[PDB]
Amino acid sequence: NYMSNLPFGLGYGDVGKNHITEFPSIPLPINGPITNKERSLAVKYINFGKTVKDGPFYTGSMTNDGIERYSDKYLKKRKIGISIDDHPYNLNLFPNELYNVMGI
Amino acid sequence: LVTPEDVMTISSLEQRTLNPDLFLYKELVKAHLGERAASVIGMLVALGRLSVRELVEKIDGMDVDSVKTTLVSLTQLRCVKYLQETAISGKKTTYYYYNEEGIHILLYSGLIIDEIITQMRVNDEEEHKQLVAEIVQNVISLGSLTVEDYLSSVTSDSMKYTISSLFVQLCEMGYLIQISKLHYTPIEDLWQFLYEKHYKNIPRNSPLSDLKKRSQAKMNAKTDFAKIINKPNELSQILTVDPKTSLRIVKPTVSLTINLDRFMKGRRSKQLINLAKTRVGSVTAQVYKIALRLTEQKSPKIRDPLTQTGLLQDLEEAKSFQDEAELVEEKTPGLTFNAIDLARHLPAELDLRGSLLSRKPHSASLINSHLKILASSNFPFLNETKPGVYYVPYSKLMPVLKSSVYEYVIASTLGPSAMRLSRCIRDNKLVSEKIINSTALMKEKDIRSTLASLIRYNSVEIQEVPRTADRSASRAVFLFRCKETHSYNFMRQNLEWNMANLLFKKEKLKQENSTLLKKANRDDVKGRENELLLPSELNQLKMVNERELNVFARLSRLLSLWEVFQMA
Amino acid sequence: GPWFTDGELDIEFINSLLTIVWRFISENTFPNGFKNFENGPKKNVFYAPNVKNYSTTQEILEFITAAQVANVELTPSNIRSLCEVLVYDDKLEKVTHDCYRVTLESILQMFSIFNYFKMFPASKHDKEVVYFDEWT
């Protein structure tokens, strides 16, 4: 009846609960104590990527009121973003389809 | 009992179905560049070859200008390969691959700058270290950096003079190789362009037939591919020119791109030296630290000279590629060195005096003795073609190094009986249910429990033994196998997926701490984080910053695990 | 042989054999044994290449028989079986002519993946913890 099938080494208490661990657990040893070198590596990681995002290499972007407040008149501009076409590049590394976007 | 709503939110079950090659690369591009470029590179991974119109009709973004901008940003990041395929019967259009290794410059950025700081012979000076760090950070952030831009950028001419000085060194070392068409086209398409020309070059009515004309065509194609690949991989033609009454200069018009191959040679040397530091005591492990450093600069290719990825290896007489690889490894005379060659490069700190006990001052005899013990070591670190002059082989070191690293990873993963069983399954080819007992003599219960805990991965291969014509594994006992190739495969998916999980956790913490991180990364706020900040908000920023330092430390520790399994 | 006892493979008894065969080689291979690693990493000494630092099978047989620890006579085939058992678990390195050597044994007993007992888990309710079974 599918219930008499049991190996001799196996028990009856262990079966029937099932479920299993929500996430399999084996504590990895690559989480060891920090060093000064590793902290500085985290720091330089932080400066990098932030460097490219503060640069013009984002291409990810997808109070916008039609009336201009007198405060917004003669107010400091946010930032003149350096355009993708503005940055000088080498033509020979880039395709012909990609030439029309750069300011030649 | 755990709620289905509870899991897949804290359990990360939906991430477990993600392919690591797509998952990690998409996460890296999403974190660094942007969401649109991430979608582009992810779709390029999902479909290897596609045009711009394929992006337009397969992604939500359908605008032509916007996809142009994001694709040119990706190409400038050296993350995309292109080729212009020509249909003779009409208008031709270019396709687009993705650069697998180009994103490592993004990933290895912290490691790349760590080694650009650590490697240099002159690093004690604080200003020089900081400027070389800045220059490498700029070159990796911008892709191809040009001295035409940089020299005009710098304000002090003497500061400008050091800039042109560091570059010639950076190009000799190999950290800066002239970027060209070779870094944007697929290997097999290069091979097909080199393979079709020599088939069209043959005049008709030759006495030879197809077998030998194809032989000569593939031979000539291999020769010309080797030439076209060996010209720009190592070269100094940019820096050769020298103007009158002036120092040596590089070509300022050309673009300088930070390379990766010699950096990974350095990382591999670092991991071998770390192996030695674990393997042997520091008296001669400190010696070995530089023994590879005098051969790492011109060390040969690590996995494939790109003549194995662009073409089918071989069908009959297959050993040719391994034979020629080891042949070149033995032929290259520069890699071979003598003890006189190593005496000029040893630092003053090392003494090499109490290092040897022959029986139970930079002396060329004793370094030669370390070199003999290295070649006589059980692991083939060096080979001795002629008395005194040895060389580093890779025709037989790679399989054993891969076996050792994978096996000790499995050991760190499982229990001592489990590493013992794996060792038996490895050394003893084709073990069985009684051969395990004869070769182990351990407790069968725990042996089999660890065996079951080890079947889950691609660690040991099972077999079916049919006592009758019909194959039923239940009717008759079964044997085991080794099949190490699947094991070396597994250490790619699991580790790449784990790295992708770290990047996902970091980006998600950024997503839920966006406003705090924005108020953090502001110029006047920077260096003044303990004054214009609320108590609880300051505490929150502090603990999350420690948390991301922790995630970066774990990321860095994991980054010493996958480059080894990325070899051949 | 004696390893067969009561139909069970003698958890306690076989383990003490696996930790006595290697022990002799660990003081025999090094110039001073394991005390040469006690002064520190930077002060240990190593043998010259041409010296016969390797141990042969006859020497281990003589040692294990004069020690009288197993209370059982050992065939050379049985000692080869023992070394076949322990060639596993990263023990005596296999050299031609049945020669053995140990390199990081003191480091083990007392990222550099080959030694991880100096690196401890997170041991915290915190996050970002990695698991090798997470992918499956």
PDB file of all heavy atoms in Angstrom, chain B residues 274 278-279 283 357-358 378 408 413 420 423 439 442 457 494 547, chain C residues 9 44 46 48 51 85 87-88 103-104 107 112-114 128 132:
ATOM      1  N   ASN B 274      50.056  32.409  -2.633  1.00  0.00           N
ATOM      2  CA  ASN B 274      49.242  32.149  -1.450  1.00  0.00           C
ATOM      3  C   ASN B 274      49.162  30.654  -1.164  1.00  0.00           C
ATOM      4  O   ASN B 274      49.199  30.230  -0.001  1.00  0.00           O
ATOM      5  CB  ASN B 274      47.850  32.746  -1.643  1.00  0.00           C
ATOM      6  CG  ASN B 274      47.120  32.954  -0.338  1.00  0.00           C
ATOM      7  OD1 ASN B 274      47.635  32.636   0.734  1.00  0.00           O
ATOM      8  ND2 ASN B 274      45.918  33.509  -0.417  1.00  0.00           N
ATOM      9  N   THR B 278      50.500  28.842   2.224  1.00  0.00           N
ATOM     10  CA  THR B 278      49.801  27.807   2.975  1.00  0.00           C
ATOM     11  C   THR B 278      50.557  26.485   2.938  1.00  0.00           C
ATOM     12  O   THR B 278      50.526  25.722   3.909  1.00  0.00           O
ATOM     13  CB  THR B 278      48.385  27.619   2.429  1.00  0.00           C
ATOM     14  OG1 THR B 278      47.769  28.899   2.235  1.00  0.00           O
ATOM     15  CG2 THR B 278      47.551  26.800   3.399  1.00  0.00           C
ATOM     16  N   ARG B 279      51.249  26.199   1.834  1.00  0.00           N
ATOM     17  CA  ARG B 279      51.838  24.876   1.655  1.00  0.00           C
ATOM     18  C   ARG B 279      53.154  24.742   2.412  1.00  0.00           C
ATOM     19  O   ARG B 279      53.372  23.756   3.126  1.00  0.00           O
ATOM     20  CB  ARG B 279      52.035  24.597   0.165  1.00  0.00           C
ATOM     21  CG  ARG B 279      52.480  23.185  -0.177  1.00  0.00           C
ATOM     22  CD  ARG B 279      53.300  23.182  -1.456  1.00  0.00           C
ATOM     23  NE  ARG B 279      53.787  21.852  -1.800  1.00  0.00           N
ATOM     24  CZ  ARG B 279      53.691  21.317  -3.010  1.00  0.00           C
ATOM     25  NH1 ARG B 279      53.153  21.983  -4.018  1.00  0.00           N
ATOM     26  NH2 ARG B 279      54.147  20.084  -3.213  1.00  0.00           N
ATOM     27  N   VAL B 283      60.032  30.687   5.190  1.00  0.00           N
ATOM     28  CA  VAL B 283      61.446  30.868   4.875  1.00  0.00           C
ATOM     29  C   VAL B 283      61.690  30.720   3.378  1.00  0.00           C
ATOM     30  O   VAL B 283      62.426  31.512   2.777  1.00  0.00           O
ATOM     31  CB  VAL B 283      62.307  29.899   5.702  1.00  0.00           C
ATOM     32  CG1 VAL B 283      63.713  29.841   5.148  1.00  0.00           C
ATOM     33  CG2 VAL B 283      62.344  30.364   7.140  1.00  0.00           C
ATOM     34  N   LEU B 357      69.292  23.029   4.936  1.00  0.00           N
ATOM     35  CA  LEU B 357      70.064  22.139   5.796  1.00  0.00           C
ATOM     36  C   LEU B 357      70.558  20.989   4.924  1.00  0.00           C
ATOM     37  O   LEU B 357      69.794  20.070   4.608  1.00  0.00           O
ATOM     38  CB  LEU B 357      69.222  21.638   6.967  1.00  0.00           C
ATOM     39  CG  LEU B 357      69.976  20.846   8.035  1.00  0.00           C
ATOM     40  CD1 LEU B 357      70.923  21.750   8.812  1.00  0.00           C
ATOM     41  CD2 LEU B 357      69.014  20.138   8.973  1.00  0.00           C
ATOM     42  N   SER B 358      71.835  21.046   4.536  1.00  0.00           N
ATOM     43  CA  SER B 358      72.351  20.129   3.522  1.00  0.00           C
ATOM     44  C   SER B 358      72.385  18.684   4.006  1.00  0.00           C
ATOM     45  O   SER B 358      72.451  17.763   3.185  1.00  0.00           O
ATOM     46  CB  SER B 358      73.746  20.570   3.079  1.00  0.00           C
ATOM     47  OG  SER B 358      73.767  21.948   2.747  1.00  0.00           O
ATOM     48  N   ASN B 378      56.270  17.436  -5.339  1.00  0.00           N
ATOM     49  CA  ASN B 378      55.239  16.547  -5.863  1.00  0.00           C
ATOM     50  C   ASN B 378      54.351  17.266  -6.870  1.00  0.00           C
ATOM     51  O   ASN B 378      53.992  16.700  -7.909  1.00  0.00           O
ATOM     52  CB  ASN B 378      54.403  15.988  -4.713  1.00  0.00           C
ATOM     53  CG  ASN B 378      55.216  15.787  -3.452  1.00  0.00           C
ATOM     54  OD1 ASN B 378      55.603  16.750  -2.790  1.00  0.00           O
ATOM     55  ND2 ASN B 378      55.481  14.533  -3.112  1.00  0.00           N
ATOM     56  N   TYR B 408      39.532  20.986  -2.343  1.00  0.00           N
ATOM     57  CA  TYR B 408      39.540  21.658  -1.053  1.00  0.00           C
ATOM     58  C   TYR B 408      38.325  22.562  -0.880  1.00  0.00           C
ATOM     59  O   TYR B 408      37.906  22.807   0.255  1.00  0.00           O
ATOM     60  CB  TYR B 408      40.827  22.454  -0.851  1.00  0.00           C
ATOM     61  CG  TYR B 408      41.187  22.547   0.613  1.00  0.00           C
ATOM     62  CD1 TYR B 408      41.955  21.562   1.221  1.00  0.00           C
ATOM     63  CD2 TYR B 408      40.706  23.579   1.402  1.00  0.00           C
ATOM     64  CE1 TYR B 408      42.271  21.628   2.564  1.00  0.00           C
ATOM     65  CE2 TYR B 408      41.011  23.648   2.747  1.00  0.00           C
ATOM     66  CZ  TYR B 408      41.794  22.673   3.323  1.00  0.00           C
ATOM     67  OH  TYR B 408      42.099  22.750   4.662  1.00  0.00           O
ATOM     68  N   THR B 413      33.329  22.681   2.164  1.00  0.00           N
ATOM     69  CA  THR B 413      31.871  22.642   2.112  1.00  0.00           C
ATOM     70  C   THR B 413      31.305  21.525   2.987  1.00  0.00           C
ATOM     71  O   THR B 413      30.276  21.711   3.648  1.00  0.00           O
ATOM     72  CB  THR B 413      31.408  22.470   0.665  1.00  0.00           C
ATOM     73  OG1 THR B 413      32.072  23.430  -0.164  1.00  0.00           O
ATOM     74  CG2 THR B 413      29.906  22.691   0.559  1.00  0.00           C
ATOM     75  N   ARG B 420      37.345  12.769   2.585  1.00  0.00           N
ATOM     76  CA  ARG B 420      38.048  11.498   2.449  1.00  0.00           C
ATOM     77  C   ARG B 420      37.437  10.647   1.342  1.00  0.00           C
ATOM     78  O   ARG B 420      38.161  10.062   0.529  1.00  0.00           O
ATOM     79  CB  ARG B 420      38.037  10.752   3.781  1.00  0.00           C
ATOM     80  CG  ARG B 420      39.123  11.201   4.747  1.00  0.00           C
ATOM     81  CD  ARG B 420      39.484  10.098   5.730  1.00  0.00           C
ATOM     82  NE  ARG B 420      40.215   9.009   5.093  1.00  0.00           N
ATOM     83  CZ  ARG B 420      39.656   7.890   4.652  1.00  0.00           C
ATOM     84  NH1 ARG B 420      38.357   7.676   4.768  1.00  0.00           N
ATOM     85  NH2 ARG B 420      40.420   6.964   4.081  1.00  0.00           N
ATOM     86  N   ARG B 423      38.319  12.107  -2.006  1.00  0.00           N
ATOM     87  CA  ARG B 423      39.738  11.774  -2.296  1.00  0.00           C
ATOM     88  C   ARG B 423      39.802  10.350  -2.855  1.00  0.00           C
ATOM     89  O   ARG B 423      40.489  10.145  -3.874  1.00  0.00           O
ATOM     90  CB  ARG B 423      40.581  11.896  -1.025  1.00  0.00           C
ATOM     91  CG  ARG B 423      41.322  13.217  -0.891  1.00  0.00           C
ATOM     92  CD  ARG B 423      42.824  13.007  -0.827  1.00  0.00           C
ATOM     93  NE  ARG B 423      43.223  11.776  -1.492  1.00  0.00           N
ATOM     94  CZ  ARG B 423      44.465  11.490  -1.864  1.00  0.00           C
ATOM     95  NH1 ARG B 423      45.466  12.261  -1.477  1.00  0.00           N
ATOM     96  NH2 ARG B 423      44.704  10.431  -2.617  1.00  0.00           N
ATOM     97  N   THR B 439      38.969   0.450   0.308  1.00  0.00           N
ATOM     98  CA  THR B 439      39.881   1.583   0.225  1.00  0.00           C
ATOM     99  C   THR B 439      39.635   2.641   1.294  1.00  0.00           C
ATOM    100  O   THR B 439      40.393   3.613   1.363  1.00  0.00           O
ATOM    101  CB  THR B 439      39.787   2.235  -1.161  1.00  0.00           C
ATOM    102  OG1 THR B 439      38.444   2.677  -1.393  1.00  0.00           O
ATOM    103  CG2 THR B 439      40.185   1.247  -2.246  1.00  0.00           C
ATOM    104  N   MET B 442      36.367   3.191   6.822  1.00  0.00           N
ATOM    105  CA  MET B 442      35.686   4.105   7.721  1.00  0.00           C
ATOM    106  C   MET B 442      34.300   3.555   8.051  1.00  0.00           C
ATOM    107  O   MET B 442      33.968   2.411   7.731  1.00  0.00           O
ATOM    108  CB  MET B 442      35.618   5.502   7.105  1.00  0.00           C
ATOM    109  CG  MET B 442      36.862   6.334   7.347  1.00  0.00           C
ATOM    110  SD  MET B 442      37.682   5.904   8.894  1.00  0.00           S
ATOM    111  CE  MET B 442      39.217   5.212   8.282  1.00  0.00           C
ATOM    112  N   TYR B 457      25.370  17.920  -5.731  1.00  0.00           N
ATOM    113  CA  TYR B 457      26.159  18.704  -6.666  1.00  0.00           C
ATOM    114  C   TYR B 457      26.587  17.830  -7.844  1.00  0.00           C
ATOM    115  O   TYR B 457      26.184  16.671  -7.975  1.00  0.00           O
ATOM    116  CB  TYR B 457      27.370  19.310  -5.958  1.00  0.00           C
ATOM    117  CG  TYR B 457      27.030  20.189  -4.771  1.00  0.00           C
ATOM    118  CD1 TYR B 457      27.962  20.422  -3.768  1.00  0.00           C
ATOM    119  CD2 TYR B 457      25.781  20.786  -4.654  1.00  0.00           C
ATOM    120  CE1 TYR B 457      27.660  21.224  -2.683  1.00  0.00           C
ATOM    121  CE2 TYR B 457      25.470  21.589  -3.572  1.00  0.00           C
ATOM    122  CZ  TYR B 457      26.412  21.804  -2.590  1.00  0.00           C
ATOM    123  OH  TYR B 457      26.105  22.601  -1.513  1.00  0.00           O
ATOM    124  N   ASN B 494      27.459  27.874  -9.297  1.00  0.00           N
ATOM    125  CA  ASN B 494      27.208  28.199  -7.894  1.00  0.00           C
ATOM    126  C   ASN B 494      27.933  29.476  -7.483  1.00  0.00           C
ATOM    127  O   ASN B 494      27.345  30.366  -6.859  1.00  0.00           O
ATOM    128  CB  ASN B 494      27.622  27.031  -6.997  1.00  0.00           C
ATOM    129  CG  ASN B 494      27.175  27.211  -5.552  1.00  0.00           C
ATOM    130  OD1 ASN B 494      26.521  28.195  -5.205  1.00  0.00           O
ATOM    131  ND2 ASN B 494      27.529  26.253  -4.703  1.00  0.00           N
ATOM    132  N   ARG B 547      27.417  47.716   7.174  1.00  0.00           N
ATOM    133  CA  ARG B 547      26.844  46.566   6.480  1.00  0.00           C
ATOM    134  C   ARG B 547      27.358  46.459   5.047  1.00  0.00           C
ATOM    135  O   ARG B 547      27.678  45.362   4.576  1.00  0.00           O
ATOM    136  CB  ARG B 547      25.319  46.657   6.499  1.00  0.00           C
ATOM    137  CG  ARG B 547      24.677  46.070   7.745  1.00  0.00           C
ATOM    138  CD  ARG B 547      23.160  46.087   7.648  1.00  0.00           C
ATOM    139  NE  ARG B 547      22.689  45.822   6.294  1.00  0.00           N
ATOM    140  CZ  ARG B 547      22.527  44.610   5.782  1.00  0.00           C
ATOM    141  NH1 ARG B 547      22.789  43.521   6.486  1.00  0.00           N
ATOM    142  NH2 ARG B 547      22.089  44.486   4.533  1.00  0.00           N
TER     143      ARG B 547
ATOM    144  N   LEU C   9      33.232  -1.631  11.674  1.00  0.00           N
ATOM    145  CA  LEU C   9      34.548  -1.150  11.281  1.00  0.00           C
ATOM    146  C   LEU C   9      35.222  -0.285  12.345  1.00  0.00           C
ATOM    147  O   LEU C   9      36.020   0.590  11.994  1.00  0.00           O
ATOM    148  CB  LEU C   9      34.456  -0.395   9.953  1.00  0.00           C
ATOM    149  CG  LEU C   9      34.775  -1.288   8.750  1.00  0.00           C
ATOM    150  CD1 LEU C   9      34.256  -0.697   7.449  1.00  0.00           C
ATOM    151  CD2 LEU C   9      36.273  -1.545   8.665  1.00  0.00           C
ATOM    152  N   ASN C  44      61.690  28.498  10.463  1.00  0.00           N
ATOM    153  CA  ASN C  44      61.796  27.067  10.234  1.00  0.00           C
ATOM    154  C   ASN C  44      62.832  26.772   9.151  1.00  0.00           C
ATOM    155  O   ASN C  44      63.128  27.605   8.292  1.00  0.00           O
ATOM    156  CB  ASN C  44      60.435  26.487   9.846  1.00  0.00           C
ATOM    157  CG  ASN C  44      59.699  27.347   8.835  1.00  0.00           C
ATOM    158  OD1 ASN C  44      60.289  28.219   8.202  1.00  0.00           O
ATOM    159  ND2 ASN C  44      58.402  27.114   8.691  1.00  0.00           N
ATOM    160  N   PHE C  46      64.439  23.831   6.233  1.00  0.00           N
ATOM    161  CA  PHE C  46      64.046  22.773   5.315  1.00  0.00           C
ATOM    162  C   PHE C  46      65.280  22.033   4.817  1.00  0.00           C
ATOM    163  O   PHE C  46      66.391  22.569   4.797  1.00  0.00           O
ATOM    164  CB  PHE C  46      63.253  23.320   4.120  1.00  0.00           C
ATOM    165  CG  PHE C  46      62.026  24.093   4.506  1.00  0.00           C
ATOM    166  CD1 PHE C  46      61.833  25.387   4.051  1.00  0.00           C
ATOM    167  CD2 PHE C  46      61.063  23.523   5.322  1.00  0.00           C
ATOM    168  CE1 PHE C  46      60.703  26.098   4.405  1.00  0.00           C
ATOM    169  CE2 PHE C  46      59.931  24.230   5.679  1.00  0.00           C
ATOM    170  CZ  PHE C  46      59.751  25.520   5.220  1.00  0.00           C
ATOM    171  N   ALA C  48      67.811  20.039   2.177  1.00  0.00           N
ATOM    172  CA  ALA C  48      68.305  20.216   0.824  1.00  0.00           C
ATOM    173  C   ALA C  48      67.667  19.180  -0.102  1.00  0.00           C
ATOM    174  O   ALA C  48      67.194  18.137   0.355  1.00  0.00           O
ATOM    175  CB  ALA C  48      69.828  20.095   0.802  1.00  0.00           C
ATOM    176  N   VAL C  51      69.001  15.356  -0.214  1.00  0.00           N
ATOM    177  CA  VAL C  51      68.834  14.538   0.980  1.00  0.00           C
ATOM    178  C   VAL C  51      67.624  13.630   0.811  1.00  0.00           C
ATOM    179  O   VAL C  51      66.636  13.993   0.157  1.00  0.00           O
ATOM    180  CB  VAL C  51      68.692  15.428   2.226  1.00  0.00           C
ATOM    181  CG1 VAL C  51      68.998  14.632   3.489  1.00  0.00           C
ATOM    182  CG2 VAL C  51      69.602  16.641   2.118  1.00  0.00           C
ATOM    183  N   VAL C  85      44.434   4.060   2.927  1.00  0.00           N
ATOM    184  CA  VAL C  85      43.341   4.713   3.636  1.00  0.00           C
ATOM    185  C   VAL C  85      43.692   6.165   3.935  1.00  0.00           C
ATOM    186  O   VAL C  85      42.865   7.068   3.752  1.00  0.00           O
ATOM    187  CB  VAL C  85      42.999   3.931   4.918  1.00  0.00           C
ATOM    188  CG1 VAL C  85      42.117   4.763   5.835  1.00  0.00           C
ATOM    189  CG2 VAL C  85      42.319   2.616   4.569  1.00  0.00           C
ATOM    190  N   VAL C  87      46.305   7.911   2.555  1.00  0.00           N
ATOM    191  CA  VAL C  87      46.752   8.760   1.426  1.00  0.00           C
ATOM    192  C   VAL C  87      45.572   9.720   1.324  1.00  0.00           C
ATOM    193  O   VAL C  87      45.782  10.832   0.840  1.00  0.00           O
ATOM    194  CB  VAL C  87      47.003   7.964   0.131  1.00  0.00           C
ATOM    195  CG1 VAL C  87      45.717   7.631  -0.604  1.00  0.00           C
ATOM    196  CG2 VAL C  87      47.981   8.679  -0.789  1.00  0.00           C
ATOM    197  N   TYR C  88      44.398   9.343   1.846  1.00  0.00           N
ATOM    198  CA  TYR C  88      43.195  10.222   1.806  1.00  0.00           C
ATOM    199  C   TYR C  88      43.159  11.145   3.032  1.00  0.00           C
ATOM    200  O   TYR C  88      43.901  10.879   3.989  1.00  0.00           O
ATOM    201  CB  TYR C  88      41.922   9.378   1.696  1.00  0.00           C
ATOM    202  CG  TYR C  88      41.932   8.380   0.566  1.00  0.00           C
ATOM    203  CD1 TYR C  88      41.455   7.093   0.742  1.00  0.00           C
ATOM    204  CD2 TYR C  88      42.421   8.722  -0.685  1.00  0.00           C
ATOM    205  CE1 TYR C  88      41.463   6.170  -0.290  1.00  0.00           C
ATOM    206  CE2 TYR C  88      42.440   7.811  -1.728  1.00  0.00           C
ATOM    207  CZ  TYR C  88      41.960   6.529  -1.531  1.00  0.00           C
ATOM    208  OH  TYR C  88      41.970   5.619  -2.560  1.00  0.00           O
ATOM    209  N   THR C 103      53.080  18.838   4.384  1.00  0.00           N
ATOM    210  CA  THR C 103      53.504  20.220   4.171  1.00  0.00           C
ATOM    211  C   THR C 103      52.768  21.220   5.056  1.00  0.00           C
ATOM    212  O   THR C 103      53.421  22.005   5.750  1.00  0.00           O
ATOM    213  CB  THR C 103      53.342  20.585   2.687  1.00  0.00           C
ATOM    214  OG1 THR C 103      51.972  20.901   2.416  1.00  0.00           O
ATOM    215  CG2 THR C 103      53.778  19.427   1.794  1.00  0.00           C
ATOM    216  N   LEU C 104      51.431  21.233   5.056  1.00  0.00           N
ATOM    217  CA  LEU C 104      50.668  22.192   5.850  1.00  0.00           C
ATOM    218  C   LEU C 104      49.981  21.536   7.045  1.00  0.00           C
ATOM    219  O   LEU C 104      48.961  22.041   7.533  1.00  0.00           O
ATOM    220  CB  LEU C 104      49.639  22.923   4.983  1.00  0.00           C
ATOM    221  CG  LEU C 104      48.522  22.165   4.258  1.00  0.00           C
ATOM    222  CD1 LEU C 104      47.322  23.078   4.070  1.00  0.00           C
ATOM    223  CD2 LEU C 104      48.983  21.632   2.912  1.00  0.00           C
ATOM    224  N   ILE C 107      49.923  23.730  10.180  1.00  0.00           N
ATOM    225  CA  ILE C 107      48.971  24.820   9.993  1.00  0.00           C
ATOM    226  C   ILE C 107      47.544  24.322  10.184  1.00  0.00           C
ATOM    227  O   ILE C 107      46.707  25.010  10.782  1.00  0.00           O
ATOM    228  CB  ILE C 107      49.175  25.468   8.613  1.00  0.00           C
ATOM    229  CG1 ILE C 107      50.659  25.780   8.408  1.00  0.00           C
ATOM    230  CG2 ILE C 107      48.336  26.729   8.483  1.00  0.00           C
ATOM    231  CD1 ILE C 107      51.081  25.836   6.969  1.00  0.00           C
ATOM    232  N   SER C 112      43.566  32.191   0.724  1.00  0.00           N
ATOM    233  CA  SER C 112      44.320  31.028   1.193  1.00  0.00           C
ATOM    234  C   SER C 112      43.363  29.894   1.557  1.00  0.00           C
ATOM    235  O   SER C 112      43.238  29.489   2.715  1.00  0.00           O
ATOM    236  CB  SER C 112      45.233  31.390   2.371  1.00  0.00           C
ATOM    237  OG  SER C 112      44.526  31.346   3.598  1.00  0.00           O
ATOM    238  N   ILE C 113      42.672  29.393   0.528  1.00  0.00           N
ATOM    239  CA  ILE C 113      41.584  28.444   0.739  1.00  0.00           C
ATOM    240  C   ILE C 113      42.079  27.176   1.419  1.00  0.00           C
ATOM    241  O   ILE C 113      41.318  26.512   2.132  1.00  0.00           O
ATOM    242  CB  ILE C 113      40.881  28.125  -0.598  1.00  0.00           C
ATOM    243  CG1 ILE C 113      41.635  27.038  -1.365  1.00  0.00           C
ATOM    244  CG2 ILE C 113      40.765  29.378  -1.452  1.00  0.00           C
ATOM    245  CD1 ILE C 113      40.793  26.318  -2.390  1.00  0.00           C
ATOM    246  N   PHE C 114      43.357  26.831   1.238  1.00  0.00           N
ATOM    247  CA  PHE C 114      43.863  25.556   1.734  1.00  0.00           C
ATOM    248  C   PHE C 114      43.935  25.505   3.255  1.00  0.00           C
ATOM    249  O   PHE C 114      44.156  24.427   3.816  1.00  0.00           O
ATOM    250  CB  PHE C 114      45.233  25.269   1.121  1.00  0.00           C
ATOM    251  CG  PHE C 114      45.190  25.024  -0.361  1.00  0.00           C
ATOM    252  CD1 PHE C 114      45.342  26.070  -1.254  1.00  0.00           C
ATOM    253  CD2 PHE C 114      44.986  23.749  -0.859  1.00  0.00           C
ATOM    254  CE1 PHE C 114      45.301  25.849  -2.617  1.00  0.00           C
ATOM    255  CE2 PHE C 114      44.942  23.520  -2.221  1.00  0.00           C
ATOM    256  CZ  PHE C 114      45.100  24.571  -3.101  1.00  0.00           C
ATOM    257  N   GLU C 128      23.541  39.015   4.242  1.00  0.00           N
ATOM    258  CA  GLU C 128      24.582  38.862   3.227  1.00  0.00           C
ATOM    259  C   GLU C 128      25.395  37.589   3.413  1.00  0.00           C
ATOM    260  O   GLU C 128      26.404  37.400   2.721  1.00  0.00           O
ATOM    261  CB  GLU C 128      25.529  40.068   3.184  1.00  0.00           C
ATOM    262  CG  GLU C 128      24.903  41.348   2.655  1.00  0.00           C
ATOM    263  CD  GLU C 128      23.933  41.977   3.635  1.00  0.00           C
ATOM    264  OE1 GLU C 128      24.376  42.383   4.729  1.00  0.00           O
ATOM    265  OE2 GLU C 128      22.730  42.066   3.309  1.00  0.00           O
ATOM    266  N   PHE C 132      26.915  27.630   0.280  1.00  0.00           N
ATOM    267  CA  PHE C 132      27.192  26.861  -0.928  1.00  0.00           C
ATOM    268  C   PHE C 132      26.020  25.985  -1.345  1.00  0.00           C
ATOM    269  O   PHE C 132      25.999  25.500  -2.481  1.00  0.00           O
ATOM    270  CB  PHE C 132      28.442  26.000  -0.735  1.00  0.00           C
ATOM    271  CG  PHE C 132      29.727  26.727  -1.016  1.00  0.00           C
ATOM    272  CD1 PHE C 132      30.943  26.171  -0.660  1.00  0.00           C
ATOM    273  CD2 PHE C 132      29.719  27.961  -1.645  1.00  0.00           C
ATOM    274  CE1 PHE C 132      32.129  26.835  -0.918  1.00  0.00           C
ATOM    275  CE2 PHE C 132      30.902  28.630  -1.906  1.00  0.00           C
ATOM    276  CZ  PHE C 132      32.107  28.066  -1.542  1.00  0.00           C
TER     277      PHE C 132
END
